[PDB]
Amino acid sequence: QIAEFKEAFSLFDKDGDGTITTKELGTVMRSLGQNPTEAELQDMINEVDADGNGTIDFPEFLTMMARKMKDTDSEEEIREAFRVFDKDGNGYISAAELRHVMTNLGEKLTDEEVDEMIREADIDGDGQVNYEEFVQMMTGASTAAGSGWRKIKLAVRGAQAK
Ligand SMILES: [Ca+2]
Ligand SMILES: [Ca+2]
Ligand SMILES: [Ca+2]
Ligand SMILES: [Ca+2]
């Protein structure tokens, strides 16, 4: 239940200082195939700042992304992820896209890691992850590589405001 947030933040702050600056969130959102501007950063920060210092605290961020609960379901975030991942939007995610997404954020991953991820997310084993199966990662992926999909999903889920 809380693990989602714990990891969502853990993967966010790499310095592990106990806060997130415009720099972090900036690259985090920009690494998701988006083009965030200074306004977006300053906005979010000032939007998640209870004191007004220009920094993201521990509970602050949690509350910010927590707003997602407001939505009837997490479908929006889900589709949004698989949608932002597929640069071509062909309807499937290739090792390339996923890899770039992990590397961009700065998530050290090995050939085996990504390989297994796609191997688990792809039942047909066509080297492409579809949405239909992509959602299955949350339907009992305990034995699967749900880990990776979770981290990436959390980053792309929190990176946004919706
Ligand atoms: Ca920081
Ligand atoms: Ca603060
Ligand atoms: Ca593709
Ligand atoms: Ca497939």
Tell me how far the alpha carbon of residue 56 lies from the centroid of ligand 2, in angstroms. Answer: 5
Question: Which has the closest alpha carbon to 129: 162, 161, 97?
Answer: 97
Residues 6+ apart with CB under 8 A from 50: 57, 60
90 annotated among ligand-binding-site residues: yes
**Side chain identity at residue 125, one-letter code:** G
Tell me: is residue 55 an annotated ligand-binding position. yes
Give the tokens for residue 65.
């992304």
For ion ligand 1, residues whose CB falls within 5 Å: 15, 21
Could you tell me the maximum CA-CA distance found in the chain, to the nearest angstrom?
A: 51
Query: CA-CA distance, 41 to 47, in Å (whole number)?
Result: 10
**Residue 21 alpha carbon to ligand 2 centre in Å:** 10
User: How many whole angstroms from 104 Cα to the centroid of ligand 2?
Assistant: 26
Please indicate if the annotation marks 160 as binding a ligand: no
Distance CA 113, CA 124 (A): 18
Contacts of residue 158, Cβ cutoff 8 Å, sequence gap at least 6: 8, 12, 61, 64, 65
Q: Which ligand is nearest to the CA of 82?
A: 3
Ligand having the closest approach to the CA of 85: 3
φ and ψ at residue 106, rounded to 5 degrees: 95, 25
What is the whole-number distance in angstroms between the Cα of residue 127 and the centre of ligand 3? Answer: 9
Whether 137 and 146 have beta carbons less than 8 Å apart is answered as yes
* Structure determination method: NMR
Ligand nearest to the CA of 16: 1
Q: Is the dihedral of CA 125, 126, 127, 132 positive or negative?
A: negative
63 is in an annotated binding site: no
